[PDB]
Amino acid sequence: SSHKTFRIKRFLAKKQKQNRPIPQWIRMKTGNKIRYNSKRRHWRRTKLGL
Amino acid sequence: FIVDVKANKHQIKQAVKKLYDIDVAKVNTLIRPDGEKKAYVRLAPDYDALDVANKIGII
Amino acid sequence: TKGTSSFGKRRNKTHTLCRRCGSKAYHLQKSTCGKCGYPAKRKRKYNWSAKAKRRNTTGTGRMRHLKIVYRRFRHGFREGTTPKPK
Amino acid sequence: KTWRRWHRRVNTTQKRYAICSALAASALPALVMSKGHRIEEVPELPLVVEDK
Amino acid sequence: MKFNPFVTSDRSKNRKRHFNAPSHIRRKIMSSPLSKELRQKYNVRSMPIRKDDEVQVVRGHYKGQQIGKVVQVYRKKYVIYIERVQREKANGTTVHVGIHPSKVVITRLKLDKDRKKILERKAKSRQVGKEKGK
Amino acid sequence: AKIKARDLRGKKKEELLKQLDDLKVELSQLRVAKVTGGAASKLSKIRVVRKSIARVLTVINQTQKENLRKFYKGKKYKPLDLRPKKTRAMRRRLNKHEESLKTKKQQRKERLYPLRKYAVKA
Amino acid sequence: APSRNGMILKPHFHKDWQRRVATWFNQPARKIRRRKARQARARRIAPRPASGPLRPIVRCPTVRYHTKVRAGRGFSLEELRVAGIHKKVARTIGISVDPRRRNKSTESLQANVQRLKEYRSKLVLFPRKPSAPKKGDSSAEELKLATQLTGPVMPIRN
Amino acid sequence: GRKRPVPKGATYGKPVHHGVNQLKFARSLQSVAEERAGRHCGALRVLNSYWVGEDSTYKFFEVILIDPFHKAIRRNPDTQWITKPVHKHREMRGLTSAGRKSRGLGKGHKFHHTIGGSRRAAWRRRNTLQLHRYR
RNA sequence: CGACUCUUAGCGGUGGAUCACUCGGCUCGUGCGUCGAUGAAGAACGCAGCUAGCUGCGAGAAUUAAUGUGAAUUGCAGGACACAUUGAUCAUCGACACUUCGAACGCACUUGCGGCCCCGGGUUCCUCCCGGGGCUACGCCUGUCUGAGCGUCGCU
RNA sequence: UGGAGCCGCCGCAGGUGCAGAUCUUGGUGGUAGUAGCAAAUAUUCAAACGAGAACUUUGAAGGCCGAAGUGGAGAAGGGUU
RNA sequence: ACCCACCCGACCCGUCUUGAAACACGGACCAAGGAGUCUAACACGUGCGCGAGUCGGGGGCUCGCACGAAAGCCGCCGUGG
RNA sequence: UAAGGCUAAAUACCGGCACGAGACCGAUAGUCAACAAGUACCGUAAGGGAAAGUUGAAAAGAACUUUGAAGAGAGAGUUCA
RNA sequence: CGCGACCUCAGAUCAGACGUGGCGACCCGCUGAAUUUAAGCAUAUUAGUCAGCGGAGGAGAAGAAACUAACCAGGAUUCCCUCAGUAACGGCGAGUGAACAGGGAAGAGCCCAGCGCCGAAUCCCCGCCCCGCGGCGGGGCGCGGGACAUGUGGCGUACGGAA
Ligand SMILES: [Mg+2]
Ligand SMILES: [Mg+2]
Ligand SMILES: [Mg+2]
Ligand SMILES: [Mg+2]
Ligand SMILES: [Mg+2]
Ligand SMILES: [Mg+2]
Ligand SMILES: [Mg+2]
Ligand SMILES: [Mg+2]
Ligand SMILES: [Mg+2]
Ligand SMILES: [Mg+2]
Ligand SMILES: [Mg+2]
Ligand SMILES: [Mg+2]
Ligand SMILES: [Mg+2]
Ligand SMILES: [Mg+2]
Ligand SMILES: [Mg+2]
Ligand SMILES: [Mg+2]
Ligand SMILES: [Mg+2]
Ligand SMILES: [Mg+2]
Ligand SMILES: [Mg+2]
Ligand SMILES: [Mg+2]
Ligand SMILES: [Mg+2]
Ligand SMILES: [Mg+2]
Ligand SMILES: [Mg+2]
Ligand SMILES: [Mg+2]
Ligand SMILES: [Mg+2]
Ligand SMILES: [Mg+2]
Ligand SMILES: [Mg+2]
Ligand SMILES: [Mg+2]
Ligand SMILES: [Mg+2]
Ligand SMILES: [Mg+2]
Ligand SMILES: [Mg+2]
Ligand SMILES: [Mg+2]
Ligand SMILES: [Mg+2]
Ligand SMILES: [Mg+2]
Ligand SMILES: [Mg+2]
Ligand SMILES: [Mg+2]
Ligand SMILES: [Mg+2]
Ligand SMILES: [Mg+2]
Ligand SMILES: [Mg+2]
Ligand SMILES: [Mg+2]
Ligand SMILES: [Zn+2]
């Protein structure tokens, strides 16, 4: 909005940190079932806890 | 710098002075959209920033 | 007009993040939740939504105090002692 | 359901009658052999032994 | 049979117990027999295998009478790597092939103090049981 | 290189602080070095220094709190920290002496009419 | 709808009864638990009868039962008074005492005095300390039995 | 008495339940009195109450309360039963002399409902299909 | 023969049935039967050398101490350590620690405004200013201090 | 073909045999390379990059929005665009 | 039993209906799923045991239950039905 | 013998901690959930709520040569496959 | 126009304590439907059942007769078997529906007020010493405070009790 509270800004920050894709060294771990992050949120489609 | 989010400019100023034996003109904080309070810290004109920068490691 | 054009003017919000339960259900005008009833001293739970009841029972969260109490009890609520040292 | 009638209760004489019937045919080599038991070389069929 | 009414004899329970076993418990699981030679000497059937014992592989492809030194113990993978027990990958690089500890025999132990005290404890219990049986 | 709990126990209070400070300094430089690449060899230390820092701080708090409960062991009113936390309810049980207070009437009863060990058929 | 002959019968399954069905899969586990707990209680009350205390003989009420006789709840005060056992003590030697029992007929009274008399004969009161004062029996009748009495103590047989 | 809290009349339902005016609470006023004294002084543990008068509009009562954690109560053995945590909120559970009376329990033919612990418990006993193993 | 269409079979696709597995459920039983103002449950936000999620933890943050264990952890790095030494790694967990909301407590929910005591810079108690620390919810009981009343008396 | 368990007989037990329920869940056709990719006048030439250009970029031309704008800035909302 | 030919026969199933190939509804195709269960009470029939009796519950005595939460036994054997 | 009070035990236990078992289910079943599930996702909100198990004994997961901008191939190799 | 008793009331960031929310399978107190059945429906039934509110404990509640009975009498409470689908209720329709006895599981009984006697013989908090201190207790010593005669403590409570 460009007029944020601090509460909201911090919320957004964490959401922004969560988006990154898996580190590829994770795929090489021993008992690995994970191939892709599957919790990736694109701003244009799917619109936050808000 | 990156600074702890709870800090006042007063605290930062006092920290910067304490750690690096330095002295500050002014501190000028903001908050990164990421979460880490950044701090621009103007040193007083008796001091050169590149000289301290070399002391602390960065360049 | 009742539909698509009127979805146009959903410019402003009813609820926000409640600060007890965390849900986006704190109604700003009422200044209550409607999930935990925030200002209300006691938590809101109802016996009709057994599914809702289960979604934030105890187990659910960290149980950061309660999980070490269970351990403490097990071995006997001993306090202020150590094992025999080396 | 759990309260399906699982257990089944039998008259006591009848239970005894069965147990007498089984004993009586633990004699009878035919009935023992037919029940599969290789009892070919055993010396006597109601096989009783010392009590050491 | 097992009569103790607090043990389990339940496939799912035993396997879960096994695969989700914690390091120190895996140490015990990953044990391996002594050579008849040592079996005579120490009065011990078998020992928890360790980083640099000398060892024969008894079964498999690498089954052989050579005595390779242990290389590492991958307790996560329930396996030990052994000196010349290895295979050339596509691009020439050698790769230490895993052998399960139980399909191996310890010819030479790596004796530290603690390993010494372990062997003293196992031998003593064995001889107590022989005295009780006699 | 290794900072153990072992040795720190005996050390003087001012000496423990200097050590913490000197680790806090060493942590700073590694954090600086993590930004500027540094080297894997440096970026190990950062974990080590952190835990040694904790090892120091821990020893200090254990020493401060041991001394503190020496100081109150005897006094009736003592800080809530130093009072024994068991479980809310368990800190409202009857006192251990208070729940075996017999009424004089009940005591007299136990004196006059004690349950006797007896058997039958002889 | 009823079809040609049968009891015009009323079952009571109109409430939500399946919400209150009470299964009995316990019962074996229960039966054991009682039994352990029973054997423990014996062992605690070491030479004392496992039974409990001695209890009076008593006739049932009503024309129906009338002829039969059970164990009652406890011996009346008159019965203790006549036997000559102090009521407060009688509890301490394993004699049940109720005090709410009247005593109408003298045939039921003298029988119940006789009971207590007989009890007091065949009772082995141990002394408080191993050093032996009055009342407490001889070490002969003590060594020869610190034995429990299995079953109800001096059982009533109609 | 107790008028039925429903808007206007509008106890929508079968005209058995249409009543709103002439109907009467289960507990007594004296119990309500205790319950309120109990509510207010949470630490305090309601022992018992008595009557001190009545206007048309009000009744008056006098609820005896006790600190369970005052040493003089704690150390006196004859009272120290109230300091036990089963006796928290007697009045709320229907356990003072007053609130006992509504429960409808006494020995003898004039009761039977409440021939287990309480009214609810007897119903419970009487409406259990005991379903035995062998039947 | 030609193309196309139909039928059958071979082989290949599409698709994921079947079968075989099962660190999950469902049911019955046993023992115990323990949360919280000494701050619960729950929520939030944090914390990894490279880590997003799940988990684990709390600015001592994938954990500190202690005790038991006795060489690993391991996706890769890097390292430590002398694994003839309180000693890697797990387990236990009694010592220590435990950010912010939350019954939730200085008053407010902006994360805004405060009061009162002490400490360091600031002064040289000059109050300011900055930083740190400790108090500052409501209700209620036992006492304590200060009181109020043409409430009931006494002496003056 | 497949690659790890499975069956006959005598008894017992059952969540035991499908074509349909505008049945449920999943999959696949014909329809079909069909309908369709038509609101608001407009594109053209050369070059560059490049494996590759109707669509990118640069230059040149021709056009439109025509300051109640297809321009220049905010509010709310989004939340890194 | 695969394909083709020819002669004769031959309307599409399910269903409700007096009457369905119907211009009556459901049904593009395939896979898997999918509906007379269990408890209680009664009655009659049948099988077994005992028989003017019969009965087993409930309880108890025998075990840490590996198989047992079985099996066995009870002046409780009959309070009682 | 009411209008005052306390009291263990046999009794209950689809929540909790910790175990044991099964003539149960075997991935459209069994819990919504065998998996980063009360997750993703939807809804202003109360609330709603999925799908999704399996290379192999071992990663030995295809070095190298060659065609192509590449995805894709052709040979070669690993594997008992 | 004072000073002093008490009574009733305030205020303290006064000293020291407690209560607040959670969980909710089981438990205690209230509150309380309507689908439904009756082949319609209104009483009845569904049901003192779901939802609603309150408060607990490891269990809760109950409990030591203002009881049963009508016998040659039993003798607190809870639980099971039975009583019994019985007595009874009921548009006497649908439907509903206990208790005593009897046999078991268990078994345990007690205390006040009052009435009276006893120099309040009682209690709480201070402060000093010795022990003990991670369930704040013992013993001693203080003209150290207060509660209390508008009644604390010992004896005693119907099974009788006192002298
Ligand atoms: Mg959008
Ligand atoms: Mg007394
Ligand atoms: Mg008995
Ligand atoms: Mg009605
Ligand atoms: Mg009355
Ligand atoms: Mg074909
Ligand atoms: Mg599938
Ligand atoms: Mg296989
Ligand atoms: Mg089945
Ligand atoms: Mg089909
Ligand atoms: Mg076209
Ligand atoms: Mg712009
Ligand atoms: Mg019809
Ligand atoms: Mg017709
Ligand atoms: Mg037809
Ligand atoms: Mg026609
Ligand atoms: Mg039709
Ligand atoms: Mg159709
Ligand atoms: Mg099928
Ligand atoms: Mg018949
Ligand atoms: Mg009571
Ligand atoms: Mg699946
Ligand atoms: Mg599947
Ligand atoms: Mg499923
Ligand atoms: Mg499958
Ligand atoms: Mg598959
Ligand atoms: Mg499959
Ligand atoms: Mg194959
Ligand atoms: Mg509460
Ligand atoms: Mg009707
Ligand atoms: Mg009808
Ligand atoms: Mg109607
Ligand atoms: Mg009713
Ligand atoms: Mg309810
Ligand atoms: Mg109770
Ligand atoms: Mg009474
Ligand atoms: Mg009775
Ligand atoms: Mg009958
Ligand atoms: Mg009724
Ligand atoms: Mg008196
Ligand atoms: Zn909320």
Curated annotation (Swiss-Prot), chain A:
Location within or outside the cell: Cytoplasm
Main function: RNA-binding component of the large ribosomal subunit. The ribosome is a large ribonucleoprotein complex responsible for the synthesis of proteins in the cell.
Any one Pfam family match given in the protein's UniProt record, by short name: Ribosomal_L39
Organism, as annotated: Oryctolagus cuniculus
Keywords, ordered alphabetically: Cytoplasm, Ribonucleoprotein, Ribosomal protein
GO cellular component, one term: cytosolic large ribosomal subunit
Gene: RPL39
Alphabetized InterPro entries for the sequence: Ribosomal_eL39 (IPR000077), Ribosomal_eL39_CS (IPR020083), Ribosomal_eL39_dom_sf (IPR023626)
Single biological process term from Gene Ontology: translation
Designated name of the protein: Large ribosomal subunit protein eL39
Assembly and oligomerization: Component of the large ribosomal subunit. Interacts with IMPACT.
HAMAP family: Ribosomal_eL39 (MF_00629)
Similarity field: Belongs to the eukaryotic ribosomal protein eL39 family.
An example Gene Ontology molecular-function term: structural constituent of ribosome
Swiss-Prot record, chain B:
From-to range in the entire protein, with total length: 98 to 156 of 156
Domain comment quoted from the record: The N-terminal beta-like import receptor binding (BIB) domain mediates interaction with IPO5, IPO7, KPNB1 and TNPO1.
Source organism superkingdom: Eukaryota
Cystines in this chain: none
UniProt record similarity statement: Belongs to the universal ribosomal protein uL23 family.
Modifications made to the protein after synthesis: N-terminus is methylated by METTL11A/NTM1. Citrullinated by PADI4.
Protein name: Large ribosomal subunit protein uL23
Lineage, broadest ranks: Eukaryota, Metazoa, Chordata, Craniata, Vertebrata
Subunit structure: Component of the large ribosomal subunit. Interacts with LYAR and GNL2. Interacts with MDM2; this interaction may promote MDM2-mediated p53/TP53 polyubiquitination. Directly interacts (via BIB domain) with IPO5, IPO7, KPNB1 and TNPO1; these interactions are involved in RPL23A nuclear import for the assembly of ribosomal subunits. Interacts with IPO8.
Cell location: Cytoplasm; Nucleus
Gene field: RPL23A
Function recorded in the entry: Component of the large ribosomal subunit. The ribosome is a large ribonucleoprotein complex responsible for the synthesis of proteins in the cell. Binds a specific region on the 26S rRNA. May promote p53/TP53 degradation possibly through the stimulation of MDM2-mediated TP53 polyubiquitination.
UniProtKB/Swiss-Prot annotation, chain F:
GO MF terms held by the record: mRNA binding; structural constituent of ribosome
Region described as Disordered: spans on this chain: 84-122
Any one Gene Ontology BP term: maturation of LSU-rRNA from tricistronic rRNA transcript (SSU-rRNA, 5.8S rRNA, LSU-rRNA)
Extent of Basic residues compositional bias: 85-95
Pfam families in the record: Ribosomal_L29 (PF00831)
Gene3D superfamilies attached to this UniProt entry: 1.10.287.310, 6.10.250.3450
Residues annotated with Phosphoserine modification: 28
Modified residues (N6-acetyllysine): 18, 42
GO CC, any one term: cytosolic large ribosomal subunit
Taxonomy, superkingdom: Eukaryota
Compartments (UniProt record): Cytoplasm
Assembly and interaction partners: Component of the large ribosomal subunit.
Similarity field: Belongs to the universal ribosomal protein uL29 family.
Protein name, UniProt field: Large ribosomal subunit protein uL29
Organism: Oryctolagus cuniculus (Rabbit)
Gene that specifies this protein: RPL35
Curated annotation (Swiss-Prot), chain H:
Biased composition (Basic residues): 100-113
This protein's UniProt keywords: Cytoplasm, Isopeptide bond, Lipoprotein, Myristate, Phosphoprotein, Ribonucleoprotein, Ribosomal protein, Ubl conjugation
Biological process annotations from GO: cytoplasmic translation
One GO molecular-function entry: structural constituent of ribosome
Record-listed Phosphoserine modification sites: 28, 31
Compartments where found: Cytoplasm
Location of cross-link Glycyl lysine isopeptide (Lys-Gly) (interchain with G-Cter in SUMO2): 14
Cellular component, GO annotation: cytosolic large ribosomal subunit
Assembly with partners or alone: Component of the large ribosomal subunit. Interacts with IFIT1 (via TPR repeats 1-4).
Function: Component of the large ribosomal subunit. The ribosome is a large ribonucleoprotein complex responsible for the synthesis of proteins in the cell.
Family to which the UniProt record says this protein belongs: Belongs to the eukaryotic ribosomal protein eL15 family.
Protein name: Large ribosomal subunit protein eL15
Organism, as annotated: Oryctolagus cuniculus (Rabbit)
Residues of the whole record sequence present: 70 to 204 of 204
